[PDB]
Amino acid sequence: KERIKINKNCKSGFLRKTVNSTKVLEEFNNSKLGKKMIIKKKRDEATDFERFQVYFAKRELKKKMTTIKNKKN
Amino acid sequence: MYKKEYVIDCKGHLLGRLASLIAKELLNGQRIVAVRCEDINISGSLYRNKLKYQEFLRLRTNTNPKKGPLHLREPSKILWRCVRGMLPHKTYKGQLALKKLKVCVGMPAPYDKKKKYVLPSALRAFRLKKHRRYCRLGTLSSRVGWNYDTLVKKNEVLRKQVSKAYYKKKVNNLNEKKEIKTEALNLINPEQRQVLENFGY
Amino acid sequence: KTIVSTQKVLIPEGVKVAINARKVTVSGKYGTLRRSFRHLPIDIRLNKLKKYIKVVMWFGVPDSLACIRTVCTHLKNMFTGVTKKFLYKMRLVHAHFPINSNIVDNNTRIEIRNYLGEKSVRFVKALPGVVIEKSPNVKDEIYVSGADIENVSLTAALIHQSVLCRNKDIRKFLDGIYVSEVTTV
Amino acid sequence: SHRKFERPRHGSLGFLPRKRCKRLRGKIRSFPKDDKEKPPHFTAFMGYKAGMTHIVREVDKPGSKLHKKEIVEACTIIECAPMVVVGIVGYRETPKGLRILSTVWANHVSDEFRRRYYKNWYKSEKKAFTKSLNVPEATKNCLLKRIEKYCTVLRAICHTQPSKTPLRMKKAHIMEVQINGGSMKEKLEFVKEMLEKNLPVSTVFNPNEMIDVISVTKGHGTKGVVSRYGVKRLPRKTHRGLRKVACIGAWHPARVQFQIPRHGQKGYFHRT
Amino acid sequence: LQAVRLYEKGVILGYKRSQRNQDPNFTLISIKNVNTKKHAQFYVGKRVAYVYRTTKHHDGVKIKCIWGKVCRTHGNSGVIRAKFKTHIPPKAFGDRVRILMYP
Amino acid sequence: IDNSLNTNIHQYHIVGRAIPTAKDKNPNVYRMCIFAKNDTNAKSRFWYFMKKINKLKKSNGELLACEQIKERFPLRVKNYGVLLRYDSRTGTHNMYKEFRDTTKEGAIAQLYSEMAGRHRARASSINIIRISEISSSLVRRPHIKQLLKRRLRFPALHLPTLQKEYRKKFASKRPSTYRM
RNA sequence: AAUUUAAUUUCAAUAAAGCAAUCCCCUGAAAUUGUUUUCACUUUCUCCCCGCACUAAUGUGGGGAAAACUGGCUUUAUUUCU
RNA sequence: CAUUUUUGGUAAGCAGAACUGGCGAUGAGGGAUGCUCCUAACGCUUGGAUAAGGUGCCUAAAUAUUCGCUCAUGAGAUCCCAUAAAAGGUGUUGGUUCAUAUGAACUAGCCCUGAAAAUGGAUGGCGCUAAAGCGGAUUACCGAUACCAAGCCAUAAAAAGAA
RNA sequence: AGCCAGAAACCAUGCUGAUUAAACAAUACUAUCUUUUUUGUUUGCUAAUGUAAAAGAGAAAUUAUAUAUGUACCGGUACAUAAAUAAUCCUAUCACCUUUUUCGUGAGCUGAGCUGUGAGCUAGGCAAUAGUUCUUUAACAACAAAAAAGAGCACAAACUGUAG
């Protein structure tokens, strides 16, 4: 989606200066596709203990969430 | 593949590619239910396809049509025949692959309860240009007199409406599950909750 | 070939449009007309406030240019039709026999009798929304009117086709009912 | 090379195989088609051919050579004992054709009906339709409701009354009759009200009607080609026979081209 | 549940065919995850086990095993050649195989 | 570096001369630039031209220089005019074509692709006589004139393809053509 | 996955300076055998005028300016910011 | 029998020559199939990497990349090889000469017409049109008993030998 | 590009066959037998074994593709929401017994109380173990024994001759 307006003849210094100015990567990170990509990147790099911790956390959540489902009726 | 049954929604899929992908899977090993098979696309025009089917009808036998070829009229059987062409069906290995394939026009309801997959490279959109003529296989079959069409049209509509009622119920259920999950995310211990958030909840 | 081809299509003041996803709909004093263009893959966009439509094509070829010019002409006809119905005035020619034009079914089916003295009936029903009236003013004249130029013309063509002889010379025998004048109300 | 003189082929290819029918009872291939405006009514009837007579009839026939003058004509007489309806059939449309959902039966049946199922009526204990003697009326109603809701074609199971005849046979012929006319509900009401009654041909048909006739032909066993197909007979001089066959044909196909006339069954064929 | 599998799934395809020609020395293996030569190259030296069920008790049991090892690809989509200690049966084509995590 | 869009046709400046003899006490030295896929091909084309123009075959001459010629500004896109002699099935023709590209070598590859695709002309049957950078206003081809407009910003409008890893055999739901 | 010292008209930034504006690294178009000389060519999300929304467009068709941000050259240092 | 040169004969998978290579006397891999075309000549085995040739499926490898051109109401698709021409075409695509972005004239690319036969019927079949078509290019992968290394067998030659 | 009418041609319809579909549906009656649980299936026979594919065999919008789905108005209008689509979600793995508090659902008694089952919280000290890998027997289906519980046809023979 994002675009930055620049003069047509520009080279690497000006491109670096402009990218640093406009902070487009932050806009990308905020963007939903970017956000899906960065979440996936974390998941890809996650260690064995980290993987267990995600399992354990989801297990705690299901216990609490099911208890809330009991609560609601 | 690595699963008991692939069900394929064959609407919008191009004949040759759809057949080839199914065939290699059958050869690899897989039971495959081809579903919704009148809405398959041929890349030729309606007249051109009618001409081809005319040539197919013309092919018979002088001797005795009791020992002649089969001019199957079902759109599902047309796909089946094409897949058979893409198998070595006079072998045992080919026959076993042939037996693994199941074909159905429209959505049979026991396999509509099941999940439907698609073959993403094989869509009409995917490998054909917009400005070039094509023809739907059911339309062609109707042109050459298969004529079991209106019943399927009614059945598909009734199934689809129920599917809409199902989809809204599913959406209701998913929204409620999201709501309870978000509420009970607060109740998780902070560090564990932070980790679960980090990895995308 | 070209990257960009455009057209800017003027719209009359009274037109009530509803053209989403190339399913064009125009409504006006004489009717609501619907006409898909979804086989044609182009970016018609509406402008309500300052009127007009802008049609643009990406990556045009002369085929595409033909499509743009065709669509704009077709759209203009749709506007023209709803604002004022298209009237095809058909004169009935005969050099010998009275040919009897009896309009039945509330201006929907013209009965024709006696082409070349045949003593028999040709009934020719109209298409949806195309009225067949006769002229009070000129005895041979027949009014074929409706919101679409294509259906009225097709209706007129059906009437010509229905009449015409098998095998008595085309140069010699001139009799039959023909489209004289294409107008609107 | 081509034949010197042309001459139409002997017999119709379209009625191969020339073989015995698998039932004595006529078989309706197809029934009358949709007419929602018409009220529900029966489409068919079985009756027994008794013989032929001749008639004298007065003729109108405008502009005929005979015209006003009277004619003598051959005619057939068919004794028609009233058929009895005993069952209701509910069929539903599928892309594989019409399929029966269920059948609903009357609250009693004839001995003559039961005789058709038994091969040895004399030496049996006759236990057919005895668990199915009765069920709750609620069950019957549910089935009728179910059939109205889902079925799109209604047939009535009818049977002949051979006990009203001089014939040796005592087994009834049992038969489906499609009902053609209005809504499935209106049809269902019509069949239910009619059910246990007896139907005269006058209840089904009107005089002067044109009617389609479905029957198996008179037998003759296995016959020669001359008899079966009417080919021109062999010359006075032959090595062998005179009802003996013509040439079968070409070397190519290297097989008998099936369109050739052949010795085999003649009569006992199904015909409309 | 009670069992933990500790292998990855595969499908024993044919032997290492070429059009109308047979090499029975090398077997072709489909590994469920893989779809590239480069990804397949990760798993390249791994030990492979074909386990199969039989009619009678052999050494008191109705389960038997053939061992092999993966060794090189057979295409850009990562379908891999495996050499076994004895040839696997054509009867077992399209059956399942176990790809161990060692060495 | 690249092997995913790469052209291996390069330009070589080649210099050679006649061997000194009693007749040819002072030789004539000849230079030309030649576009080829390799140095042997470049030399053989240079030798063919030496044969076609002069009386000098490989035997009669000696090579002074062959060197690949270097792109001044590869990041800059430039307007190349190219002048051809080519052979058809039934005749020989001259033609002058325009290509906007980064470099002359890309243009020659494009030219061979164009002649092959549109005219069925193989590389062997084409001879480039001059390829050079020319002013933008002097181009005759509409497709290049369209690029040379002030504001260029078309919608992309092409199919996804990804790569082998994420080239899935089957899918749960149907793809998104628009991509936005 | 790399790696060594060469070779071959190969850069790009870094931040301070300068230099020229249809001008310049360039690239055009012109007056046996060498020269060499002429004027043609950048940007703009800057400003103005006409057409005032006239556009494919978060603008625009035509006509003019402005600058040197952009690019280009000369420097002075700097290279794991790049 | 084949390429090339070639004589007779309307021509001929016809008759007759020349040079060379094949087959005969020869497996093997490709040419969809095929004594002869192409690749290539062979003990028994293991492994490699390639050739001719392929890589939509049958059928092993790419629904690869990359630029063109191509829609056909009987398209087209690997030498030999199983038809095809003169001649047309306001189908589309490039060129080139003229005139005043339009009007001419030519030109060759594709496509169309020219283009009819005998069981039912043959791009090998299914199929393929954002090609799996035609013309290129870019790689990777697959691909032989040919190629390299290793073992073993026999044959040939050579070493060397009468605690 | 988009269309229309239009032939003894074409495909259905019609009609004939359909052990051409190694096809099938509905109905009727019947064979100490069916159903649930346990143990077994290392004189031609008389206890009895077979699986081409268990390993989380997990996953039901939809027309689409030069835009979709809801919601609100009258098949159209307006307003939201998807757009790496399985690159996602679901989902396992807190053995034990024993102390404590809550919620779902089944069963027995005369709505409710209790028990069972499923899910959690709270407290304790309690298990595993074969000397290094060569299947991790973990899946489906069938059968034999043992208990417990459930409920007559056809052919022939004579007769026929619409048949041969």
**Partner-chain residue, chosen from B181, B189, B199, that has the shortest CB–CB distance to A54:** B199
Give F35 CA → G27 C1' in Å. 21
Q: Does F172 touch chain B (CB under 8 A)?
A: yes
**Are chains E and B in touch, 3+ Cβ pairs below 8 Å?**
yes
Q: Does B2 touch chain E (CB under 8 A)?
A: yes
The answer to whether the peptide bond before residue F175 is cis (omega within 30 degrees of 0) is: no
B61 close to B69: Cβ distance less than 8 angstroms: yes
Neighboring chain C residues of B131 at a CB cutoff of 8 Å? 41, 63
Strand runs (DSSP E) across D115-159, as ranges? 153-159
Is F161 within 7 A of strand H by CB distance?
Answer: yes
What's the distance, CA D228 to chain centroid? 23
Residues 6+ apart with CB under 8 A from C125: C105, C108, C109
Give A7 CA → G49 C1' in Å. 26
**How far is residue C10's CA from residue C76's CA, in Å, rounded to a whole number?**
8
Is B24 within 7 A of strand H by CB distance?
Answer: yes
Is B129 within 7 A of strand H by CB distance?
Answer: yes
Neighboring chain A residues of B173 at a CB cutoff of 8 Å? none
Neighboring chain A residues of B181 at a CB cutoff of 8 Å? 61, 65
Q: Count of CB atoms within 10 A of residue C20's CB?
A: 9
Instruction: Using alpha carbons, select from C80, C177, C77 the residue that is nearest to residue C135.
Output: C177
What one-character DSSP code corresponds to residue B117? Answer: B
One-letter identity of residue A4 = I
**Partner-chain residue, chosen from E9, E11, E32, that has the shortest CB–CB distance to B29:** E11
Compute φ and ψ for F62, nearest 5 degrees.
-145, 140
HSE-CB of E50 using CA atoms within 13 angstroms: 26
Residue F136 in tokens:
């933008």
CB contact under 8 A, D255 and B64: yes
Angle between helices B15-28 and B92-100 (to 10 degrees): 110
CB contact under 8 A, C2 and F146: yes
Give D269 CA → I153 C1' in Å. 33
Q: What are the CA-CA distances from residue D65 to residues D56, D57, D61, D188, F150 (Å)?
A: 18, 16, 9, 51, 94
D179 close to D148: Cβ distance less than 8 angstroms: no
Is F149 within 7 A of strand G by CB distance?
Answer: yes
Give F174 CA → H137 C1' in Å. 34
DSSP state letters, B151-187: HHHHHHHHHHHHHHHHHHHHHHHHHHHHHHHHHTTSS
Residues 6+ apart with CB under 8 A from E24: E15, E87
Residues 6+ apart with CB under 8 A from D45: D80, D83, D177, D199, D201, D204, D205
The answer to whether the peptide bond before residue E90 is cis (omega within 30 degrees of 0) is: no
Q: Does B148 touch chain D (CB under 8 A)?
A: yes
What's the distance, CA D29 to chain centroid? 8
HSE-CB of D207 using CA atoms within 13 angstroms: 0
Residue E84 in tokens:
């076994």
**How far is residue F100's CA from residue F140's CA, in Å, rounded to a whole number?**
12
**Partner-chain residue, chosen from D93, D94, D255, that has the shortest CB–CB distance to B63:** D255
**How far is residue C10's CA from residue C27's CA, in Å, rounded to a whole number?**
16
Stated in angstroms to one decimal place, the resolution of this structure is 4.7
Q: Count of CB atoms within 10 A of residue E50's CB?
A: 22
Residue D52 in tokens:
């032929």
By DSSP bridging, strand D153-159 and strand D174-180 are antiparallel
F47 close to F69: Cβ distance less than 8 angstroms: no
**How far is residue F11's CA from residue F8's CA, in Å, rounded to a whole number?**
10
**How far is residue D92's CA from residue B155's CA, in Å, rounded to a whole number?**
12
CB contact under 8 A, E76 and F164: yes
Residue E70 in tokens:
């993966």
Q: Write down which chains contact chain F via at least 3 CB pairs under 8 A.
A: B, C, E
Is E47 within 7 A of strand H by CB distance?
Answer: no
Is B63 within 7 A of strand H by CB distance?
Answer: yes
Q: Does B66 touch chain C (CB under 8 A)?
A: no
Instruction: Using alpha carbons, select from E35, C31, D113, A36 the residue that is nearest to residue F166.
Output: E35
Residues 6+ apart with CB under 8 A from B101: B22, B26, B31, B32, B34, B80, B83
HSE-CB of E62 using CA atoms within 13 angstroms: 4
Strand runs (DSSP E) across chain E, as ranges? 8-15, 26-31, 47-53, 63-73, 80-84, 96-99
Q: Does B66 touch chain D (CB under 8 A)?
A: yes
Give C153 CA → I7 C1' in Å. 25
Three-class secondary structure of residue D248 per DSSP: coil
**How far is residue E79's CA from residue E34's CA, in Å, rounded to a whole number?**
8
